[PDB]
Amino acid sequence: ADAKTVQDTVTQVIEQNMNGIDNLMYMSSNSDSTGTVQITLTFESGTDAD
Amino acid sequence: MPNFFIDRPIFAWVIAIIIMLAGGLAILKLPVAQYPTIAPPAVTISASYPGADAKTVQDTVTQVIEQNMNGIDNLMYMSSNSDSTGTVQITLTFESGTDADIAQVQVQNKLQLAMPLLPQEVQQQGVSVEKSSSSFLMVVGVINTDGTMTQEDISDYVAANMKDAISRTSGVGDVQLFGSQYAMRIWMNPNELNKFQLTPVDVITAIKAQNAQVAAGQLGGTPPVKGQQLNASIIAQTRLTSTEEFGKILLKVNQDGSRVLLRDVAKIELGGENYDIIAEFNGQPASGLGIKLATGANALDTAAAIRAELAKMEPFFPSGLKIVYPYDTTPFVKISIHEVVKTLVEAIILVFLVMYLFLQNFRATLIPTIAVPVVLLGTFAVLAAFGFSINTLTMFGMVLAIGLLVDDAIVVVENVERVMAEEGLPPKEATRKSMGQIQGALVGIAMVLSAVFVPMAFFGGSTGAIYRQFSITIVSAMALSVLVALILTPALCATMLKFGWFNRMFEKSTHHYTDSVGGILRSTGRYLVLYLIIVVGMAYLFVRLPSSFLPDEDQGVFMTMVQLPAGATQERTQKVLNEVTHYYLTKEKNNVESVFAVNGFGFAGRGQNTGIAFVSLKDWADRPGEENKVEAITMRATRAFSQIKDAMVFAFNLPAIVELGTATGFDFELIDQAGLGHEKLTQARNQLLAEAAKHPDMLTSVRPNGLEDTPQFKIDIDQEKAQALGVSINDINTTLGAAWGGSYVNDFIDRGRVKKVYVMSEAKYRMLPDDIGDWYVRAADGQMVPFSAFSSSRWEYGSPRLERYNGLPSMEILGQAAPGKSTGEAMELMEQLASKLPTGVGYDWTGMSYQERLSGNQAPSLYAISLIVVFLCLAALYESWSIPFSVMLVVPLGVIGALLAATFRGLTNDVYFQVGLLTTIGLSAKNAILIVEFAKDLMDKEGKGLIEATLDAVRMRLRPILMTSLAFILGVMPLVISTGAGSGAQNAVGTGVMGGMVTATVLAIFFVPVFFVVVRRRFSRK
Ligand SMILES: CN(C)c1ccc(O)c2c1C[C@H]1C[C@H]3[C@H](N(C)C)C(O)=C(C(N)=O)C(=O)[C@@]3(O)C(O)=C1C2=O
């Protein structure tokens, strides 16, 4: 029961903060109707995933 | 090798090109920041509890939380604040180079298990965990200079339309807003409220149901019916998004169709979430944004892009929202970079000027000019090899060293212009013989200079990190050099190599000189004394000479500290800020560029009571005379601000490395170590404080860095009476709660942004212990009941700030050493004074005092091992367990004279001094090794004069020294040693090297050719 709602409520927020993190190349999130959200960060090759 | 290289010099330019390439490309990969990272890694832990107080925070939250920091790796110590405004910081400093990213995990990670025991008020505000830095890169400010937007208004914008915009820009390692963002405010009044028999709770529990976010399946999705067609998503209740819809909330309805709306019982409007810190820029409403570096990005680079992004977006939203920059640590860095660069560049011009005056040539002075930039560049690649960076510390690292490579160059091309001179052969055969008589010396002095340098970078903590900066710099330059002077120079001067007021005024002063030195050497131990004075002298000057870390400097800004007393008030505090502002703009109007003033940011707590005012002056330029400088402007201020009402208002210049170990002072912490309550500790604290005033011998200013108990208004619910009337102990407390300290209902959305919703009494019904009488609660039978009915009130003292060191109620005192005595010996007293307190009370040293204690004194222990490797190394340069001795006794010469940073100027043993004091002992013992080389060499090869050589030795030597030692001093003499601004360390570095270098030459010309004589004759003697 949540159009936008999710994004801008959980999405934007978790996104706002994904800043700082080293070796970041691009972020891309997809807020979903089902209420599901999926933020995704990907780093420069080599970077140490743990 | 060089002999194989002089033969193919074609190649020893490829070796030279590579290096230059590496060092060029490395330049670009270099990050640039003002300093490097030198504080051990800390981690704060903040927390809120709207309307609490220290106990009601130390025992609901800071404890608890803290009973759980167990499990976490490399931790040094952990303190914690619990003050009277709902705040809880809880920073945790950690061993030297532990991985910050991984410590913050666990710290944080381990919080995650206490939250279950935090109270629900707190877990809603949420506890954040982050890395302790509170003062970095630049701090944009956003004011409105046409009274439209208030603090909160401006904050919002800055939050809503630009904060993230910056936040994601090449650099921006973290933003921190200087205000809030709107929040649904809902200020009730017991009156309009008690008239409907509704309390805060009734209001609270409505703003819930009414403003919430429900759930409601699709249509198909989950298993549907055969042959269905439309699946759609149902959209049930969803959060209000306005003061409008908020205004309309069914709170009550009673036989009248009576419509009692949230709009009646109180008053709705957007506003800020916290309201107790008034920011304003030059008497204008303001709401800045601070921005921290980035980790590995570039101070310059990223400042520029911030300025970019800010530009581009300022063409927006009505009323002039003008972006100001009351702080940018960048101009300061760039001007340093711009100097130093000239120091080097010019240092070379010097080696061209000097050297000409000495070697009739040109294609000779072209050599060190092709060696220097080759050695610099290229060390810029060793810096990038060890992950280092272009920062103040690392730069002066090569300037303090400019004189060590430059030398090296001259030294080679001037032995060739002797050998092909003193009945020599052509360029080739000259080099071969020349570059081959200093060959092994040029090495060996390698291994030597590696010690008396390496040893740094082994030191303590916060410091010692600095030291490392310097150490690897130099040694990376230094040795990199010695390597080109065995490869590119010996092929560069061969292959290239072919006024009366000099030459015709030198060839004879040499002779006068060596002659003068000639004889005066029979009674050898003539000047064996005289010297012994010198040494003994230093051993005086040293002790006499004061100590420091880094000389403070004029930077963009500095600050004033206001502090109204005991229980003052934001409003009463503002006026003080307005003055501070005034007696700054308008009475210092040709220097103060702006004052950014905020009340609520004390430096030893918060509260309406204290504030602080950061002032940004105008460009070092428009600030000419020493009177127009910081270490001057603040003087006026400090005083001019005495003569102020009950309002301690200080002003002072920030230290070199904001975020680092301040004064040579101490940081002491008195621990609760048992039962003993607040009180007992206080009496304890007070014992020792007073005890130490009685001792201004060992100097002091022992001061509790913390807050005296103030009085406090104490409610007190009568449980029984509560039970007797129909009145819930819960219902009471939320009403009194909410009312007076305000509660944070739930969220709502506002122009696409979730934002909090607070609800608390108007200000009118919550200022005075009276008013409490305005508040009514609905009881069981449904009759409003006043406080007095079930509660009584008394004054009393309690602590607005409860502080506590690792786990345990503590109290922190700080103070200085002694205008005479050492930080060290001053701690020791403080400790004996501690030694006699009541039993319960323990004591522990934190902070600067932590390192200083732990590591601290090692200078001895370390350089012992150098002075040994120096010997060893040196001994096998020659081939005796004694001869090297003739190389060592140089150390004192250079030292004295370098120590006339005392007797000539007004300085201190500060780092920049000691690094130089090393750079200086390198040319000194270098000189020695050579003169003691050519001492034997022709004494050993041509079996020459047991003393005859010595004279000749020094002869073929007075020009190298005189040559270099000239271009140096002059090189170090410029703005270096005479400066205005963005400097400090310039005076630092020069002055040290400037003297001492004098004595190193002008005094070793005589001794070193001695020494060698006084010895080389004490061994196998009769
Ligand atoms: C002193 N510190 C650098 C400044 C300077 C200027 C400012 O204008 C401000 C601060 C602190 C920040 C802290 C923040 C905090 N937070 C990020 C929401 C916060 O928890 C509070 C609070 N005490 O409730 C603020 O007052 C606060 O909103 C605030 O208004 C600030 C603020 O206005």
GROMACS .gro file of N, CA and C in nm, chain B residues 546-659:
model
  342
  596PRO      N    1   6.341   2.633   2.535
  596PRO     CA    2   6.205   2.582   2.561
  596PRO      C    3   6.163   2.472   2.460
  597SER      N    4   6.043   2.415   2.480
  597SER     CA    5   5.995   2.306   2.395
  597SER      C    6   5.853   2.323   2.345
  598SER      N    7   5.831   2.274   2.223
  598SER     CA    8   5.700   2.273   2.162
  598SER      C    9   5.686   2.170   2.053
  599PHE      N   10   5.570   2.170   1.987
  599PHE     CA   11   5.542   2.074   1.883
  599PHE      C   12   5.548   2.150   1.756
  600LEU      N   13   5.453   2.239   1.738
  600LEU     CA   14   5.440   2.305   1.613
  600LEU      C   15   5.404   2.442   1.654
  601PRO      N   16   5.483   2.543   1.611
  601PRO     CA   17   5.442   2.681   1.633
  601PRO      C   18   5.304   2.715   1.567
  602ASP      N   19   5.210   2.750   1.652
  602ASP     CA   20   5.084   2.805   1.611
  602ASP      C   21   5.105   2.892   1.489
  603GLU      N   22   5.006   2.905   1.397
  603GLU     CA   23   5.013   3.007   1.290
  603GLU      C   24   4.885   3.083   1.268
  604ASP      N   25   4.898   3.197   1.197
  604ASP     CA   26   4.784   3.284   1.155
  604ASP      C   27   4.723   3.195   1.055
  605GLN      N   28   4.593   3.171   1.067
  605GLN     CA   29   4.517   3.106   0.959
  605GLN      C   30   4.396   3.190   0.943
  606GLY      N   31   4.317   3.157   0.841
  606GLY     CA   32   4.194   3.232   0.811
  606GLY      C   33   4.114   3.294   0.924
  607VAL      N   34   4.107   3.220   1.034
  607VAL     CA   35   4.020   3.253   1.144
  607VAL      C   36   4.079   3.241   1.282
  608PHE      N   37   3.990   3.265   1.376
  608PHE     CA   38   4.009   3.225   1.516
  608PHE      C   39   3.877   3.251   1.591
  609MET      N   40   3.871   3.228   1.723
  609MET     CA   41   3.744   3.233   1.791
  609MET      C   42   3.739   3.302   1.926
  610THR      N   43   3.617   3.334   1.964
  610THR     CA   44   3.589   3.393   2.090
  610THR      C   45   3.501   3.297   2.163
  611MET      N   46   3.522   3.290   2.292
  611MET     CA   47   3.448   3.201   2.375
  611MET      C   48   3.355   3.278   2.471
  612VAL      N   49   3.222   3.272   2.454
  612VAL     CA   50   3.140   3.340   2.555
  612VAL      C   51   3.098   3.241   2.658
  613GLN      N   52   3.060   3.285   2.778
  613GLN     CA   53   3.016   3.193   2.886
  613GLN      C   54   2.939   3.265   3.000
  614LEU      N   55   2.811   3.296   2.974
  614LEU     CA   56   2.725   3.354   3.074
  614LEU      C   57   2.728   3.258   3.196
  615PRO      N   58   2.689   3.306   3.316
  615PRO     CA   59   2.718   3.212   3.427
  615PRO      C   60   2.607   3.105   3.444
  616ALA      N   61   2.623   3.032   3.556
  616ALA     CA   62   2.530   2.930   3.605
  616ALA      C   63   2.416   2.913   3.516
  617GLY      N   64   2.303   2.962   3.552
  617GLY     CA   65   2.196   2.919   3.466
  617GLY      C   66   2.154   3.023   3.371
  618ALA      N   67   2.237   3.075   3.281
  618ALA     CA   68   2.181   3.186   3.196
  618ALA      C   69   2.079   3.155   3.088
  619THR      N   70   2.081   3.223   2.977
  619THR     CA   71   1.978   3.200   2.881
  619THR      C   72   2.016   3.244   2.748
  620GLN      N   73   1.982   3.158   2.656
  620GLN     CA   74   1.998   3.186   2.518
  620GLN      C   75   1.982   3.335   2.499
  621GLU      N   76   1.866   3.393   2.532
  621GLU     CA   77   1.849   3.534   2.502
  621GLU      C   78   1.956   3.621   2.565
  622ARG      N   79   1.980   3.605   2.695
  622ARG     CA   80   2.093   3.672   2.769
  622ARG      C   81   2.226   3.637   2.708
  623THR      N   82   2.241   3.516   2.656
  623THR     CA   83   2.365   3.482   2.584
  623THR      C   84   2.378   3.548   2.448
  624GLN      N   85   2.269   3.567   2.377
  624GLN     CA   86   2.281   3.628   2.248
  624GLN      C   87   2.349   3.761   2.268
  625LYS      N   88   2.297   3.844   2.358
  625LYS     CA   89   2.340   3.986   2.358
  625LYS      C   90   2.491   3.989   2.366
  626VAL      N   91   2.545   3.894   2.442
  626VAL     CA   92   2.687   3.889   2.458
  626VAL      C   93   2.750   3.860   2.327
  627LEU      N   94   2.684   3.778   2.246
  627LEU     CA   95   2.735   3.743   2.115
  627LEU      C   96   2.726   3.862   2.022
  628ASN      N   97   2.616   3.935   2.027
  628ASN     CA   98   2.599   4.057   1.952
  628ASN      C   99   2.711   4.161   1.978
  629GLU      N  100   2.735   4.197   2.104
  629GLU     CA  101   2.866   4.264   2.136
  629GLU      C  102   2.992   4.199   2.071
  630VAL      N  103   3.026   4.076   2.111
  630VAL     CA  104   3.136   4.011   2.053
  630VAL      C  105   3.134   4.039   1.910
  631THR      N  106   3.025   4.008   1.841
  631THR     CA  107   3.010   4.041   1.700
  631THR      C  108   3.054   4.185   1.675
  632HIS      N  109   2.998   4.280   1.754
  632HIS     CA  110   3.019   4.425   1.735
  632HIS      C  111   3.167   4.464   1.751
  633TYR      N  112   3.217   4.460   1.873
  633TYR     CA  113   3.357   4.494   1.901
  633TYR      C  114   3.451   4.416   1.814
  634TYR      N  115   3.398   4.358   1.704
  634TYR     CA  116   3.474   4.284   1.597
  634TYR      C  117   3.447   4.345   1.463
  635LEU      N  118   3.322   4.340   1.416
  635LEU     CA  119   3.281   4.426   1.304
  635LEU      C  120   3.260   4.558   1.369
  636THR      N  121   3.333   4.661   1.324
  636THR     CA  122   3.322   4.797   1.380
  636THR      C  123   3.406   4.815   1.504
  637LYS      N  124   3.536   4.811   1.482
  637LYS     CA  125   3.635   4.843   1.580
  637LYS      C  126   3.746   4.749   1.545
  638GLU      N  127   3.723   4.673   1.439
  638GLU     CA  128   3.826   4.592   1.386
  638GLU      C  129   3.786   4.569   1.247
  639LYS      N  130   3.725   4.672   1.186
  639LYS     CA  131   3.648   4.656   1.058
  639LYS      C  132   3.733   4.631   0.931
  640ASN      N  133   3.863   4.659   0.942
  640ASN     CA  134   3.964   4.629   0.838
  640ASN      C  135   4.042   4.496   0.856
  641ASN      N  136   3.984   4.405   0.934
  641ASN     CA  137   4.036   4.272   0.953
  641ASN      C  138   3.925   4.163   0.969
  642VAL      N  139   3.832   4.182   1.062
  642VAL     CA  140   3.720   4.091   1.076
  642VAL      C  141   3.647   4.096   0.946
  643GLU      N  142   3.637   3.982   0.876
  643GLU     CA  143   3.560   3.973   0.752
  643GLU      C  144   3.421   3.924   0.787
  644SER      N  145   3.414   3.826   0.878
  644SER     CA  146   3.285   3.791   0.930
  644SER      C  147   3.304   3.723   1.059
  645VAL      N  148   3.203   3.737   1.144
  645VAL     CA  149   3.188   3.652   1.258
  645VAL      C  150   3.060   3.565   1.242
  646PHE      N  151   3.086   3.433   1.249
  646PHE     CA  152   2.987   3.330   1.265
  646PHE      C  153   2.977   3.296   1.409
  647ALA      N  154   2.864   3.335   1.471
  647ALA     CA  155   2.835   3.312   1.614
  647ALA      C  156   2.716   3.216   1.640
  648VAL      N  157   2.735   3.124   1.735
  648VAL     CA  158   2.634   3.029   1.771
  648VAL      C  159   2.633   3.014   1.922
  649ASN      N  160   2.513   3.015   1.984
  649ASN     CA  161   2.496   2.989   2.130
  649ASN      C  162   2.428   2.855   2.149
  650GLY      N  163   2.497   2.767   2.220
  650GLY     CA  164   2.446   2.637   2.244
  650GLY      C  165   2.561   2.544   2.227
  651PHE      N  166   2.663   2.593   2.157
  651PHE     CA  167   2.791   2.522   2.139
  651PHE      C  168   2.898   2.576   2.231
  652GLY      N  169   2.881   2.554   2.358
  652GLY     CA  170   2.991   2.580   2.447
  652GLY      C  171   3.101   2.484   2.412
  653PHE      N  172   3.216   2.507   2.471
  653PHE     CA  173   3.315   2.405   2.453
  653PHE      C  174   3.331   2.315   2.573
  654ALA      N  175   3.245   2.323   2.674
  654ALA     CA  176   3.263   2.230   2.785
  654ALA      C  177   3.128   2.178   2.826
  655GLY      N  178   3.036   2.189   2.729
  655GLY     CA  179   2.894   2.154   2.750
  655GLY      C  180   2.812   2.233   2.650
  656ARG      N  181   2.677   2.227   2.662
  656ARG     CA  182   2.589   2.307   2.581
  656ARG      C  183   2.495   2.374   2.669
  657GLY      N  184   2.377   2.409   2.619
  657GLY     CA  185   2.274   2.477   2.702
  657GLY      C  186   2.266   2.624   2.669
  658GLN      N  187   2.153   2.685   2.698
  658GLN     CA  188   2.130   2.823   2.664
  658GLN      C  189   2.251   2.908   2.716
  659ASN      N  190   2.334   2.847   2.801
  659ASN     CA  191   2.426   2.919   2.889
  659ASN      C  192   2.536   2.968   2.803
  660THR      N  193   2.619   2.879   2.748
  660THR     CA  194   2.741   2.916   2.668
  660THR      C  195   2.719   2.924   2.516
  661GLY      N  196   2.804   2.999   2.448
  661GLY     CA  197   2.804   3.000   2.305
  661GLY      C  198   2.948   3.024   2.263
  662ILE      N  199   2.975   3.027   2.135
  662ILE     CA  200   3.108   3.055   2.088
  662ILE      C  201   3.095   3.128   1.949
  663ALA      N  202   3.188   3.219   1.920
  663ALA     CA  203   3.180   3.297   1.799
  663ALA      C  204   3.307   3.287   1.719
  664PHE      N  205   3.297   3.214   1.609
  664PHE     CA  206   3.406   3.193   1.513
  664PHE      C  207   3.410   3.316   1.422
  665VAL      N  208   3.525   3.386   1.420
  665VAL     CA  209   3.550   3.500   1.332
  665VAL      C  210   3.660   3.475   1.229
  666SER      N  211   3.623   3.507   1.105
  666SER     CA  212   3.702   3.498   0.981
  666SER      C  213   3.747   3.639   0.937
  667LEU      N  214   3.878   3.659   0.939
  667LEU     CA  215   3.941   3.787   0.912
  667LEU      C  216   3.946   3.804   0.762
  668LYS      N  217   4.013   3.912   0.715
  668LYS     CA  218   4.034   3.936   0.569
  668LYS      C  219   4.174   3.896   0.529
  669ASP      N  220   4.188   3.868   0.399
  669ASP     CA  221   4.310   3.811   0.337
  669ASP      C  222   4.445   3.863   0.392
  670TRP      N  223   4.532   3.771   0.436
  670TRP     CA  224   4.666   3.803   0.488
  670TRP      C  225   4.723   3.932   0.430
  671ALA      N  226   4.691   3.959   0.303
  671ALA     CA  227   4.734   4.079   0.236
  671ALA      C  228   4.679   4.204   0.304
  672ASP      N  229   4.548   4.220   0.301
  672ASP     CA  230   4.484   4.338   0.355
  672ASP      C  231   4.511   4.342   0.501
  673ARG      N  232   4.587   4.244   0.545
  673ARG     CA  233   4.632   4.231   0.684
  673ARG      C  234   4.785   4.231   0.680
  674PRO      N  235   4.845   4.354   0.677
  674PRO     CA  236   4.986   4.387   0.659
  674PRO      C  237   5.072   4.385   0.788
  675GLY      N  238   5.057   4.485   0.874
  675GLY     CA  239   5.146   4.493   0.990
  675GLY      C  240   5.121   4.381   1.090
  676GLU      N  241   5.222   4.345   1.167
  676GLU     CA  242   5.206   4.247   1.273
  676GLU      C  243   5.088   4.274   1.362
  677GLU      N  244   5.053   4.400   1.375
  677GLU     CA  245   4.935   4.443   1.449
  677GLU      C  246   4.804   4.398   1.385
  678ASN      N  247   4.808   4.374   1.254
  678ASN     CA  248   4.694   4.327   1.180
  678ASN      C  249   4.688   4.180   1.164
  679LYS      N  250   4.761   4.108   1.248
  679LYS     CA  251   4.765   3.962   1.247
  679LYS      C  252   4.691   3.899   1.364
  680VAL      N  253   4.680   3.766   1.358
  680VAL     CA  254   4.596   3.700   1.454
  680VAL      C  255   4.659   3.709   1.585
  681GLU      N  256   4.781   3.658   1.594
  681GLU     CA  257   4.843   3.649   1.725
  681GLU      C  258   4.845   3.789   1.783
  682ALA      N  259   4.804   3.890   1.704
  682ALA     CA  260   4.779   4.028   1.752
  682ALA      C  261   4.631   4.068   1.777
  683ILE      N  262   4.540   4.039   1.682
  683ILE     CA  263   4.402   4.086   1.688
  683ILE      C  264   4.329   4.031   1.807
  684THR      N  265   4.366   3.910   1.842
  684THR     CA  266   4.303   3.841   1.951
  684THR      C  267   4.346   3.910   2.079
  685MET      N  268   4.472   3.951   2.089
  685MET     CA  269   4.517   4.026   2.206
  685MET      C  270   4.420   4.137   2.246
  686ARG      N  271   4.391   4.226   2.151
  686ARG     CA  272   4.297   4.336   2.167
  686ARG      C  273   4.164   4.289   2.223
  687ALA      N  274   4.090   4.220   2.135
  687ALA     CA  275   3.979   4.135   2.171
  687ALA      C  276   3.979   4.078   2.317
  688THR      N  277   4.057   3.974   2.345
  688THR     CA  278   4.073   3.917   2.481
  688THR      C  279   4.058   4.024   2.589
  689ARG      N  280   4.127   4.135   2.568
  689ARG     CA  281   4.130   4.236   2.670
  689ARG      C  282   4.001   4.312   2.659
  690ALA      N  283   3.986   4.383   2.547
  690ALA     CA  284   3.863   4.459   2.512
  690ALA      C  285   3.725   4.393   2.550
  691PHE      N  286   3.732   4.261   2.574
  691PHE     CA  287   3.621   4.179   2.611
  691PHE      C  288   3.624   4.153   2.759
  692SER      N  289   3.741   4.168   2.825
  692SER     CA  290   3.734   4.185   2.970
  692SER      C  291   3.658   4.316   2.972
  693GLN      N  292   3.641   4.384   3.086
  693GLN     CA  293   3.540   4.495   3.093
  693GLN      C  294   3.397   4.458   3.036
  694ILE      N  295   3.353   4.331   3.053
  694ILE     CA  296   3.216   4.283   3.019
  694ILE      C  297   3.148   4.219   3.141
  695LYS      N  298   3.025   4.264   3.165
  695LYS     CA  299   2.926   4.204   3.260
  695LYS      C  300   2.954   4.058   3.286
  696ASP      N  301   2.908   4.006   3.399
  696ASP     CA  302   2.900   3.859   3.417
  696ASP      C  303   2.884   3.776   3.281
  697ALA      N  304   2.996   3.763   3.208
  697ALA     CA  305   3.000   3.699   3.083
  697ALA      C  306   3.143   3.670   3.039
  698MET      N  307   3.219   3.583   3.109
  698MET     CA  308   3.355   3.544   3.063
  698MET      C  309   3.358   3.531   2.912
  699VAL      N  310   3.426   3.622   2.841
  699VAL     CA  311   3.435   3.614   2.695
  699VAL      C  312   3.579   3.616   2.654
  700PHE      N  313   3.632   3.500   2.616
  700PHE     CA  314   3.771   3.483   2.572
  700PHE      C  315   3.784   3.489   2.421
  701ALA      N  316   3.907   3.503   2.372
  701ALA     CA  317   3.937   3.488   2.228
  701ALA      C  318   4.076   3.428   2.211
  702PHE      N  319   4.094   3.346   2.109
  702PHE     CA  320   4.216   3.273   2.097
  702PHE      C  321   4.239   3.210   1.962
  703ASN      N  322   4.365   3.198   1.925
  703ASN     CA  323   4.396   3.143   1.797
  703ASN      C  324   4.403   2.991   1.799
  704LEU      N  325   4.331   2.924   1.708
  704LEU     CA  326   4.339   2.775   1.701
  704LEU      C  327   4.483   2.729   1.676
  705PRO      N  328   4.520   2.612   1.726
  705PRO     CA  329   4.649   2.547   1.704
  705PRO      C  330   4.667   2.494   1.562
  706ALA      N  331   4.792   2.457   1.530
  706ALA     CA  332   4.836   2.409   1.396
  706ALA      C  333   4.746   2.305   1.334
  707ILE      N  334   4.737   2.195   1.407
  707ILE     CA  335   4.658   2.081   1.365
  707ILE      C  336   4.530   2.069   1.447
  708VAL      N  337   4.431   2.156   1.420
  708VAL     CA  338   4.304   2.157   1.496
  708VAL      C  339   4.283   2.023   1.574
  709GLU      N  340   4.248   1.921   1.497
  709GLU     CA  341   4.225   1.785   1.548
  709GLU      C  342   4.358   1.712   1.582
   0.00000   0.00000   0.00000
